[PDB]
Design an enzyme around this catalytic site. Structure first.
Site, short mmCIF file in Angstrom:
data_model
loop_
_atom_site.label_atom_id
_atom_site.label_comp_id
_atom_site.label_asym_id
_atom_site.label_seq_id
_atom_site.Cartn_x
_atom_site.Cartn_y
_atom_site.Cartn_z
N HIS A 100 23.13 -7.43 23.29
CA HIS A 100 23.44 -6.62 22.50
C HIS A 100 24.20 -6.66 21.32
CE1 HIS A 100 27.13 -6.48 25.37
NE2 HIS A 100 27.70 -6.52 24.22
N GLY A 108 36.17 -6.38 23.04
CA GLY A 108 35.80 -7.75 22.53
C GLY A 108 35.44 -9.06 23.42
N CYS A 149 33.25 -9.32 25.50
CA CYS A 149 31.85 -9.47 25.87
C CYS A 149 31.44 -11.07 25.45
CB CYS A 149 30.79 -8.59 25.21
SG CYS A 149 31.43 -6.83 25.90
#
Ligand SMILES: *C(=O)NCCCCCC
Lengths: 300, 300
Positions: free
Chosen positions: B40, B145, B147
């Protein structure tokens, strides 16, 4: 929901070494040209009952100490000097640790949290976080050969080294020394039975936990009644709580919840007697192992 | 005592990088000539609700991605290939990470524990341990943040990477990918509301925790009474516990204490209805995030 979080340990892993003196071996911490380790590495196993550490350091010669780095490129480090500071040895080696981080030596106070790198014979095996208990013990997981394991916090890129593990007390209470050499809680590095003081609740941490409860919708315990800090602290001396000391971290919780410190100090006085029929964040016991800084970073 | 123990994180820290694509940035894992990160990163925030990753993959070139390593040896890299694999991007860079550890990829099962290195923009900031929940989520601290943060176990010298963080579902509930690219629990990487199954207690871990309690002299809950595994498992289906499946790890604790598994299965059924006013190892609820392997290690 709060989680126990440690610092990344990589910087500290790069400083761990094994220190051996005669038949005894344990962990040490290699910073610049210095290797720090617990002085009881000098003490033969039979003689731990009471050792004369001054009558041990004189017996030490140029090659009494051997130091090994296992992690990274394996190396033996030649020891060129030896000195004693408190309950720690300060060993001079001829090579500076090329991976020495920016560091300080600060002593931690009860209620504060720090990260522990558990090691065995110079090899990191695990990492966890503890809070310094009011009786100057920690509730760690240390097995045989973990003496010299290192506790630390980190601000910016600066490592603050605050703990070097020395011994196990009761079933699992541990203590160690600050890097100025003083043993936390004045315990003595001898195989003699020593009594720990009674533990207490860390009041500032209980307050942080009640702020975390309020932040997660759990606030039935808040009422307008207030207990002043000075009044709370006199109550605390009689009821197995620490003195409360405010911090800017606590203030940020009070600002975001609109609930004043003095209201939670009142609530604690009520909740100590019992939660009556209710729960707080799923618990029926007060929780004192999360700090204001924990609540601030995790429930931002 | 029972401490939440993580693997030392130095090996994984030296593999964390920042990956940027357009206006999106997150964490990636640099192993040899490969940088792994959630796919993503290709999706602008507006069309995060219904992305077309096959179209997005076509619209990309090697020049669409930049990768930086911030910590340790600050080298930054050129992407010379890109591919998609399930919910993961697999970028090829022109420098092999000289700090790559021996490693495998394996998918973990519910009940199993692993360490997490939480990072932000390629900087490691914390470490903690989670267990893969029966609903294929985990509970940790994953702020904005994080991820691309990575979960792993360590066996000998070999890191087993098992988790790459992808999304938050409900408050505090998180999930991610195995490094084969499949999302744990088959969740979709879309800012869309999806329903998670109900969580359950991991019975095998609760049993290990009671064993740890017995080994520490907290055994008020042990009765002669027993429930068979077959019969506990039928009860479990109705009370949101997992199936109990014994392991040699559990058998060692039963041997050491003299208390049969079946005695603890009976006690769980009784403790589920409430501890009355009593505590077990500090706790007023059942704990299921300690594994039998973990208990065997810490308590021996
Ligand atoms: C650690 O290596 N040994 C613990 C025993 C030391 C007892 C006196 C300090």
């Amino acid at each position: 929901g709060l989680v126990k979080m440690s610092h990344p340990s990589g910087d500290v892993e790069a400083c761990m070494v094994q220190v051996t003196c005669g038949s005894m071996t344990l962990n040490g911490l290699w910073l610049d040209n210095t290797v720090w380790c617990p002085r009881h590495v000098m003490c033969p196993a039979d003689q731990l009952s009471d050792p004369n550490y001054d009558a041990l350091l004189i017996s030490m010669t140029n090659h009494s100490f051997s130091v090994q780095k296992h992690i990274g490129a394996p190396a033996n480090l030649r020891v060129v000097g030896h000195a004693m500071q408190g309950t720690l040895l300060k060993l001079t080696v001829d090579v500076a640790n090329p991976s020495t981080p920016a560091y300080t030596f600060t002593t931690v106070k009860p209620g504060a949290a720090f990260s522990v790198l558990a090691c065995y014979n110079g090899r990191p095996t695990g990492t966890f976080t503890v809070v310094m208990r009011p009786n100057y013990t920690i509730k760690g997981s240390f097995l045989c050969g973990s003496c010299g394991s290192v506790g630390y916090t980190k601000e910016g890129s600066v490592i603050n080294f605050c703990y070097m593990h020395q011994m196990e007390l009761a079933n699992g209470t541990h203590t160690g020394s600050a890097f100025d050499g003083t043993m936390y809680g004045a315990f003595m590095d001898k195989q003699v039975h020593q009594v720990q003081l009674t533990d207490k609740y860390c009041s500032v941490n209980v307050v942080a936990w009640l702020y975390a409860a309020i932040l997660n919708g759990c606030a039935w315990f808040v009422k307008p009644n207030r207990t002043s800090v000075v009044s709370f602290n006199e109550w605390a001396l009689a009821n197995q709580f620490t003195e409360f000391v405010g911090t800017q971290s606590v203030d940020m919780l009070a600002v975001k919840t609109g609930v004043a410190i003095e209201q939670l100090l009142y609530a604690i006085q009520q909740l100590y007697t019992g939660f009556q029929g209710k729960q707080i964040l799923g618990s029926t016991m007060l929780e004192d192992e999360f700090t204001p800084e924990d609540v601030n970073m995790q429930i931002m």
